[PDB]
Tab-separated table of N, CA, C and O in Angstrom:
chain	number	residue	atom	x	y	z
A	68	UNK	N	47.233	-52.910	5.651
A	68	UNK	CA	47.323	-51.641	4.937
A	68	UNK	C	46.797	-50.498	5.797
A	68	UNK	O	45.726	-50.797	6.325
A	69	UNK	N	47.433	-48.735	6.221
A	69	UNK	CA	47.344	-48.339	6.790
A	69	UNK	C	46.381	-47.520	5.947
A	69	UNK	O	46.624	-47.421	4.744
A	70	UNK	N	45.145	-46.829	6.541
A	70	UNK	CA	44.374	-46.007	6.418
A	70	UNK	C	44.492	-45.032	5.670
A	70	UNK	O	43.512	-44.575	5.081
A	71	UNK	N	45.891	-44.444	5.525
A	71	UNK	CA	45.880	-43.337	5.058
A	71	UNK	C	46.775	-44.024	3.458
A	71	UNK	O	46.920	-43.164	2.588
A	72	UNK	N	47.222	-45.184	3.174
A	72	UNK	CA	47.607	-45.641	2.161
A	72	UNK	C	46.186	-45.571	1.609
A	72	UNK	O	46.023	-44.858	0.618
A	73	UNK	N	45.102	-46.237	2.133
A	73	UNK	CA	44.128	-46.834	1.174
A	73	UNK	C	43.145	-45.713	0.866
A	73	UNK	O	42.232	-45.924	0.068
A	74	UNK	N	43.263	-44.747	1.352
A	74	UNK	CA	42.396	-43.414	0.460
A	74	UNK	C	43.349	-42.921	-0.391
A	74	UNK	O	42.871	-42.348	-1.370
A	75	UNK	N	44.287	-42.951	-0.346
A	75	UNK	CA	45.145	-42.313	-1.664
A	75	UNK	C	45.087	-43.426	-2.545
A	75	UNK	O	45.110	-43.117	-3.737
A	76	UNK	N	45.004	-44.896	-2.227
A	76	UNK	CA	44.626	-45.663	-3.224
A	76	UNK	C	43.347	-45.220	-4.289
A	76	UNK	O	43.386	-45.020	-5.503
A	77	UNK	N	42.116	-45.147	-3.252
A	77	UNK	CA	40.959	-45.054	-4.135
A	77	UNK	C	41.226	-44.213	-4.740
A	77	UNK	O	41.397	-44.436	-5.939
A	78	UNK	N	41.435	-42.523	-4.120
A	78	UNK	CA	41.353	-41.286	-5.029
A	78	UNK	C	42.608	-41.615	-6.329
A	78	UNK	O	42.527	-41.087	-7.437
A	79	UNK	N	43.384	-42.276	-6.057
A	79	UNK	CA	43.957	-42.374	-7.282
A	79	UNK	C	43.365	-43.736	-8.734
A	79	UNK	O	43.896	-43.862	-9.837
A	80	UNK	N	42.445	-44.352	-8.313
A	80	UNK	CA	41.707	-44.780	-8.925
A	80	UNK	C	40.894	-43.939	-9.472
A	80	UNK	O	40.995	-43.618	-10.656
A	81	UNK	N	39.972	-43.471	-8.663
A	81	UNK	CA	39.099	-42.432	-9.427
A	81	UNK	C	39.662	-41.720	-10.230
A	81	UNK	O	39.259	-41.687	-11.392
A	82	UNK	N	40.671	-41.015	-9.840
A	82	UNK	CA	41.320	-40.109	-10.812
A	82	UNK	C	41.692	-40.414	-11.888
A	82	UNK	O	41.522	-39.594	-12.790
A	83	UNK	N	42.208	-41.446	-12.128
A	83	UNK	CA	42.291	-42.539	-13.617
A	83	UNK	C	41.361	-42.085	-14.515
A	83	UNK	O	41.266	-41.360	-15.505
A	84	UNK	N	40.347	-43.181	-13.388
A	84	UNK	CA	39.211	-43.232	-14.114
A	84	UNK	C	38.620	-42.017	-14.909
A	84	UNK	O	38.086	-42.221	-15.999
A	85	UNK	N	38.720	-40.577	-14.306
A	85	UNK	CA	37.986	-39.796	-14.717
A	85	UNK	C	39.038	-38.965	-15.969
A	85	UNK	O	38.636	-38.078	-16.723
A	86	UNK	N	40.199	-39.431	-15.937
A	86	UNK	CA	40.854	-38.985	-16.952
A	86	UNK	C	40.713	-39.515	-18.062
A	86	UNK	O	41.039	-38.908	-19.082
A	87	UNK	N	40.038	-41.141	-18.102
A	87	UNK	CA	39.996	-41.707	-18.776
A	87	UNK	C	38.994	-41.386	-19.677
A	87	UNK	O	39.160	-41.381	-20.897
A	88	UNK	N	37.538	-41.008	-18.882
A	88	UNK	CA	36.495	-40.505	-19.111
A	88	UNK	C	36.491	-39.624	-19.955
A	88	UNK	O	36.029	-39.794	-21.083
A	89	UNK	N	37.118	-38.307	-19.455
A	89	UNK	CA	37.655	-36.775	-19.866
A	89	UNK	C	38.265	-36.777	-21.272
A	89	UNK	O	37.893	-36.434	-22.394
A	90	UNK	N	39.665	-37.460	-20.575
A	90	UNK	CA	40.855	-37.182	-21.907
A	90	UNK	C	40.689	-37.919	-23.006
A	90	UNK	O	41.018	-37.457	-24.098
A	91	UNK	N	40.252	-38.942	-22.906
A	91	UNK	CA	40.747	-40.303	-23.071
A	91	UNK	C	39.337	-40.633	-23.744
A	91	UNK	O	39.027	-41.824	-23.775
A	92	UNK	N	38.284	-39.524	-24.388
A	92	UNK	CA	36.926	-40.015	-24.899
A	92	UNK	C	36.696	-41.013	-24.571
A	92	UNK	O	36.247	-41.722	-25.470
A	93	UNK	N	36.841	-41.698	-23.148
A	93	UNK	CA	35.664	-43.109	-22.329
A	93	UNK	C	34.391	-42.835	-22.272
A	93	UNK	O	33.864	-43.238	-21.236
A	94	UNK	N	33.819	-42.387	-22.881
A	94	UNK	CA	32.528	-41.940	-22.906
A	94	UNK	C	31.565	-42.954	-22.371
A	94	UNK	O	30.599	-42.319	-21.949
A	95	UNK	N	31.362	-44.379	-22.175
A	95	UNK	CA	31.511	-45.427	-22.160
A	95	UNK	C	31.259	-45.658	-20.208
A	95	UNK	O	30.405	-46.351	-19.655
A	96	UNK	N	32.146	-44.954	-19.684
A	96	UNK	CA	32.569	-44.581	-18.277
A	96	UNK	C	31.328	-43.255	-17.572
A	96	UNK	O	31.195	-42.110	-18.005
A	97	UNK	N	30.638	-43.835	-16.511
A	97	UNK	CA	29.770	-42.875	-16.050
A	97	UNK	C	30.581	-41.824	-14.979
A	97	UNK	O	31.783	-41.969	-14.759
A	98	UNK	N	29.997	-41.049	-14.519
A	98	UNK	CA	29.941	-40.101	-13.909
A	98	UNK	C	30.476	-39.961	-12.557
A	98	UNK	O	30.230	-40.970	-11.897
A	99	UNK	N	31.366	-38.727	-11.666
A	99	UNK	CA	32.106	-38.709	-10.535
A	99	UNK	C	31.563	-39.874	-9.598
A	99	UNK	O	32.109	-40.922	-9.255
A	100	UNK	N	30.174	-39.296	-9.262
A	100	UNK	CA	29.483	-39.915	-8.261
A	100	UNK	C	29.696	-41.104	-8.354
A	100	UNK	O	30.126	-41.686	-7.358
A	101	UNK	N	29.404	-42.007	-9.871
A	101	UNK	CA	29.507	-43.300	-10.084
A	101	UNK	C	30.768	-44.124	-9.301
A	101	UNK	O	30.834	-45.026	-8.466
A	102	UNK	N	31.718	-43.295	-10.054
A	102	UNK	CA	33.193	-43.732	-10.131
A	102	UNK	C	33.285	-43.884	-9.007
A	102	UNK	O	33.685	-44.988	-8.637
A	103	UNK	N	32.896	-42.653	-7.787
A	103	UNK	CA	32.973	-42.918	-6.216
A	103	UNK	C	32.596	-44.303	-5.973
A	103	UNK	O	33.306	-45.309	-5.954
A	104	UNK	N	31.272	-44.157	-5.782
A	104	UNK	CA	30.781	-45.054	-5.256
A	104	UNK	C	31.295	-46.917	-5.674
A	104	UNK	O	30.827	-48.018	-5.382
A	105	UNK	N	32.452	-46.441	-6.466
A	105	UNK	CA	32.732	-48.087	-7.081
A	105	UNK	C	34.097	-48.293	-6.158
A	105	UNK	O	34.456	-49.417	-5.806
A	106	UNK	N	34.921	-46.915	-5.753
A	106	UNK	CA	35.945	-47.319	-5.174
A	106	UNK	C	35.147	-47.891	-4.121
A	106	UNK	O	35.053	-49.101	-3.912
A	107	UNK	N	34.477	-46.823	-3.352
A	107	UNK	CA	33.933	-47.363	-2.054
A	107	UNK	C	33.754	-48.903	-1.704
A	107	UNK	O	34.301	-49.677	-0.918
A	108	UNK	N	32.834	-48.984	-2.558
A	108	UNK	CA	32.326	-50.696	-2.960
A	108	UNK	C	33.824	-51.537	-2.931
A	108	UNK	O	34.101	-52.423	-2.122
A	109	UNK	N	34.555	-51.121	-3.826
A	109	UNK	CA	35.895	-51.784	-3.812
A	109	UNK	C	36.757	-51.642	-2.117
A	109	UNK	O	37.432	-52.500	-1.547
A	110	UNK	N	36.505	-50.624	-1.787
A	110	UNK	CA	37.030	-50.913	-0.220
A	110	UNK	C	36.437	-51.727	0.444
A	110	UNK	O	37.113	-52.575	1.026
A	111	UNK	N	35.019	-51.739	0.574
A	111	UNK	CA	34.144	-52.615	1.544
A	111	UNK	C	34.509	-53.993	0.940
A	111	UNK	O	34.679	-54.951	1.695
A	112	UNK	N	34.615	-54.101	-0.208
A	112	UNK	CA	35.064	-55.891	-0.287
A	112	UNK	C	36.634	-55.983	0.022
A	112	UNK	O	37.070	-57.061	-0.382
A	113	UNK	N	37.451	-55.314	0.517
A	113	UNK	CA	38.554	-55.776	0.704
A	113	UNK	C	38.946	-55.696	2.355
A	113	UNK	O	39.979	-55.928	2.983
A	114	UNK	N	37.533	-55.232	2.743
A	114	UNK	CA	37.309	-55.343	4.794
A	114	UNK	C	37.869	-54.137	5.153
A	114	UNK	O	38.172	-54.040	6.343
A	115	UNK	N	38.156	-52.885	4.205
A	115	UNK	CA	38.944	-51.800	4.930
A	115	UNK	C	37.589	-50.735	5.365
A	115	UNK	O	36.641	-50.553	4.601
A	116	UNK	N	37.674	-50.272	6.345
A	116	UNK	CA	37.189	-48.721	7.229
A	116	UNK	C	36.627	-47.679	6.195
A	116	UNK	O	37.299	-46.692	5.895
A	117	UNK	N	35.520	-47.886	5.711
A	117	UNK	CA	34.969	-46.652	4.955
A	117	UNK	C	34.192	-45.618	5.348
A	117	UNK	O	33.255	-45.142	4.707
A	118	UNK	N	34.678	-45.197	6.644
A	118	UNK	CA	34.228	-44.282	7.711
A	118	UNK	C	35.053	-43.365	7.454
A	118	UNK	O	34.646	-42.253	7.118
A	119	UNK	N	36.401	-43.654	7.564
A	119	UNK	CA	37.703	-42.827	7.699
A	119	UNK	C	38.207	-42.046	6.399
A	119	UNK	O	39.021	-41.127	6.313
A	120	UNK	N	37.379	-42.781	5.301
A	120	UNK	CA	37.247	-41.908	4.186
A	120	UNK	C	37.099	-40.492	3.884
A	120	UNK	O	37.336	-40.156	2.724
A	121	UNK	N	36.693	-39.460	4.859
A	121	UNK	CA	36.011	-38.060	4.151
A	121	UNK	C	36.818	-37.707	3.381
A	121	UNK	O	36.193	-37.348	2.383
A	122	UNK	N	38.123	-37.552	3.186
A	122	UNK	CA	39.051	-36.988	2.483
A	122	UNK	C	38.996	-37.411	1.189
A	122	UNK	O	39.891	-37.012	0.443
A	123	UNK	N	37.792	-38.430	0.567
A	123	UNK	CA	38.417	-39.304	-0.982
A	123	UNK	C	37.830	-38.228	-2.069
A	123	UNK	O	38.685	-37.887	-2.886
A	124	UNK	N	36.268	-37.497	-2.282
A	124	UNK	CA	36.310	-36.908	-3.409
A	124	UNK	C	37.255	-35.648	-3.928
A	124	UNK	O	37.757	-35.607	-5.051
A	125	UNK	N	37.401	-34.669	-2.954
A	125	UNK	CA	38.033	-33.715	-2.855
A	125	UNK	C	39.986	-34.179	-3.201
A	125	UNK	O	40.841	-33.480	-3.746
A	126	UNK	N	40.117	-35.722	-2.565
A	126	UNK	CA	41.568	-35.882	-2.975
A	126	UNK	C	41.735	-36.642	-4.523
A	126	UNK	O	42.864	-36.862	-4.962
A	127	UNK	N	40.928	-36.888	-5.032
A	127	UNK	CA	40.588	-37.188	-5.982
A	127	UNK	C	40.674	-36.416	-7.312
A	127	UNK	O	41.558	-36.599	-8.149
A	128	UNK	N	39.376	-35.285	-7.448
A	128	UNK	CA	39.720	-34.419	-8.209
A	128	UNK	C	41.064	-33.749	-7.831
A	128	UNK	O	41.484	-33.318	-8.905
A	129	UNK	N	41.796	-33.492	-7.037
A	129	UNK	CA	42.818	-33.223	-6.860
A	129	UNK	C	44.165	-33.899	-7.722
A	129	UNK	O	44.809	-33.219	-8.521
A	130	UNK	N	44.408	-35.016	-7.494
A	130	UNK	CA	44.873	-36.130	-8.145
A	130	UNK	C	44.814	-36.243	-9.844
A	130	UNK	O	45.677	-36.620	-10.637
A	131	UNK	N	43.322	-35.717	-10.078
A	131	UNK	CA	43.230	-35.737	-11.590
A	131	UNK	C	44.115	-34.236	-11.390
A	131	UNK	O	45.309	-34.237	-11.689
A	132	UNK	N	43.630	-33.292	-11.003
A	132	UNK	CA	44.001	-32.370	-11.895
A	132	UNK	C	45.740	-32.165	-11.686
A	132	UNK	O	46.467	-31.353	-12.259
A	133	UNK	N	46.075	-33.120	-10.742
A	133	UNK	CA	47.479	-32.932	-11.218
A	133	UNK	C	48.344	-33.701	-12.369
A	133	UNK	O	49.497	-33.466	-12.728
A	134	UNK	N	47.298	-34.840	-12.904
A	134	UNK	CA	47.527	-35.480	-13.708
A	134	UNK	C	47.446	-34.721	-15.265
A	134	UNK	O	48.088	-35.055	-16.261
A	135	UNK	N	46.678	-33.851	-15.175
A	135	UNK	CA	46.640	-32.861	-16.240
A	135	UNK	C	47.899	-32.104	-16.938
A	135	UNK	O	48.179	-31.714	-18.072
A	136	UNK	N	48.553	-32.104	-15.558
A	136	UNK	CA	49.898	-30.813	-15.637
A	136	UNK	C	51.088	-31.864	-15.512
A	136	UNK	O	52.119	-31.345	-15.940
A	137	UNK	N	51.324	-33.368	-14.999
A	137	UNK	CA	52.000	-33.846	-15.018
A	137	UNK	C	53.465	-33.894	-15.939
A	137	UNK	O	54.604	-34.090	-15.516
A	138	UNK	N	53.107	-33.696	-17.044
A	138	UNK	CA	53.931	-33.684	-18.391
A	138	UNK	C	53.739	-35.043	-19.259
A	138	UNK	O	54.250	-35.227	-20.364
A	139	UNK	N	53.033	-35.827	-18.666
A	139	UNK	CA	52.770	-37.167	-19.843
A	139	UNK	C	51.919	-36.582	-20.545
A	139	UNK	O	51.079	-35.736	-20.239
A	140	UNK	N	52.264	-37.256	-21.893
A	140	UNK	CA	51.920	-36.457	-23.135
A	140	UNK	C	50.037	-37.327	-22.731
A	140	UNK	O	49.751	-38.016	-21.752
A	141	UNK	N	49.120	-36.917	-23.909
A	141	UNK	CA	47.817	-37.697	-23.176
A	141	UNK	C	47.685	-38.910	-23.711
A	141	UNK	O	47.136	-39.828	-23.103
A	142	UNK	N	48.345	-39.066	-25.308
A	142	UNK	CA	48.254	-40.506	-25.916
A	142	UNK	C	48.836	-41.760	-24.843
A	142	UNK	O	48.332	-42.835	-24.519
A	143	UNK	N	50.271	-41.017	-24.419
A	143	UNK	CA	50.669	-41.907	-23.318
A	143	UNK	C	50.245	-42.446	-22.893
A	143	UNK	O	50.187	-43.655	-23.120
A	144	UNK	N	49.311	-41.413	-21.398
A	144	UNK	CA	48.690	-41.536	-20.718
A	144	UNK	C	47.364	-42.547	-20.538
A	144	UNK	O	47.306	-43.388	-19.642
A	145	UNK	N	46.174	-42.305	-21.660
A	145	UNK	CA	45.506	-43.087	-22.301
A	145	UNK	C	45.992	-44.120	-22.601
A	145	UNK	O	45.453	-44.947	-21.866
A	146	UNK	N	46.747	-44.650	-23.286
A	146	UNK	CA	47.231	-45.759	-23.629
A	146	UNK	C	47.578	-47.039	-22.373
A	146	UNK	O	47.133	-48.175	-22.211
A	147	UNK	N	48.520	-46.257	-21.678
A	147	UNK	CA	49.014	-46.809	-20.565
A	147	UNK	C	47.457	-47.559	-19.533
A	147	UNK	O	47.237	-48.725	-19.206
A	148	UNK	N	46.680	-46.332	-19.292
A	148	UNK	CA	45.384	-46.461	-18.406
A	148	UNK	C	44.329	-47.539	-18.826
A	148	UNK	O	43.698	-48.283	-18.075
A	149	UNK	N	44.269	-47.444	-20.427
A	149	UNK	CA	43.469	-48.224	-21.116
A	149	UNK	C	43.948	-49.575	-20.767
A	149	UNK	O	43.293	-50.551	-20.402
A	150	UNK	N	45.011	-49.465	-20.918
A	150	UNK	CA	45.657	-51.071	-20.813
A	150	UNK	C	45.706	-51.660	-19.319
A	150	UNK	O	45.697	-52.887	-19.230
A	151	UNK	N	45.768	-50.731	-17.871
A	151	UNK	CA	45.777	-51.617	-17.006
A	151	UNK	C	44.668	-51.421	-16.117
A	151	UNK	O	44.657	-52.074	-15.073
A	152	UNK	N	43.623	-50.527	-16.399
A	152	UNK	CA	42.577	-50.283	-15.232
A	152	UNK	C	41.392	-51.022	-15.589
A	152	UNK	O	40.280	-50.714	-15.159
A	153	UNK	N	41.668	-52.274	-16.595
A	153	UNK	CA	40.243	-53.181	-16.498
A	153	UNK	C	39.596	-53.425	-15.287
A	153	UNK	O	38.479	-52.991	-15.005
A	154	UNK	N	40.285	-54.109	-14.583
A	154	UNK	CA	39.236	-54.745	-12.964
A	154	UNK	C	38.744	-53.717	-12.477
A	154	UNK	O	37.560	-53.868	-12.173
A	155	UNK	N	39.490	-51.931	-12.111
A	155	UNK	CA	38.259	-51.544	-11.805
A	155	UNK	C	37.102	-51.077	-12.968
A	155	UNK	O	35.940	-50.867	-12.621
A	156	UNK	N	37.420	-50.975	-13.986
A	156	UNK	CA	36.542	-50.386	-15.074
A	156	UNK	C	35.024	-51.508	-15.258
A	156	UNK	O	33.901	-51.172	-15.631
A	157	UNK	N	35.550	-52.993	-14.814
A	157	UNK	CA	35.001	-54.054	-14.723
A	157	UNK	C	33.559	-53.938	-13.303
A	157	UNK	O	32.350	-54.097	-13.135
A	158	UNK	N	35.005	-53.497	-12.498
A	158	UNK	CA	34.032	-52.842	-10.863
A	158	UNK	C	32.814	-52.052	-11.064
A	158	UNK	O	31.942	-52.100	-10.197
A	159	UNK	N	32.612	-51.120	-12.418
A	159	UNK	CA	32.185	-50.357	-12.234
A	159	UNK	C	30.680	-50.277	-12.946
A	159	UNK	O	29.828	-49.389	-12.929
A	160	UNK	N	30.729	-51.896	-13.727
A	160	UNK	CA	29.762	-52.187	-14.909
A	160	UNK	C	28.642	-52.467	-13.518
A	160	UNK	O	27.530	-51.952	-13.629
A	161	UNK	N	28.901	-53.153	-12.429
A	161	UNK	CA	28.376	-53.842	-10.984
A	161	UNK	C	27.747	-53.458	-10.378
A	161	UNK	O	26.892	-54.068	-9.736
A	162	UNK	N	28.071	-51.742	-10.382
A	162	UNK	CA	27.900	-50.233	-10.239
A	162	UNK	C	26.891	-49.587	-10.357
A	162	UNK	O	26.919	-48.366	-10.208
């Protein structure tokens, strides 16, 4: 997996996550920093370069906020997220 796949991976994890948080009353779900630090964790166990990272918080909130304007309605959205982002939501209890 090339470098620049796997930071758009995380930040699009996070971004989930924090919609989930946000939109999606996860209240349940801690805080940016948290959420970071779980992708991270999730890179280092999969042996990838978490040096080459600087680009993840900044692409992140980015990511959410285009998820905002996307046009999925939010029940959708929620619904959909709820249902497949267990393992990292799981990642993040570890956290």
């Amino acid at each position: 997996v090339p470098a620049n796949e796997q930071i758009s991976q995380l930040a699009s994890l996070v971004a989930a996550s924090k919609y989930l948080r946000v939109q999606c009353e996860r209240s349940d779900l801690p805080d940016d920093g948290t959420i970071l630090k779980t992708a991270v964790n999730v890179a280092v166990q999969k042996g990838w370069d978490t040096g080459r990272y600087q680009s993840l918080p900044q692409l992140s909130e980015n990511l959410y906020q285009g998820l905002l304007k996307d046009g999925t309605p939010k029940a959708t959205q929620c619904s959909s997220f709820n249902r497949t982002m267990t393992p990292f939501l799981d990642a993040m209890r570890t956290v």
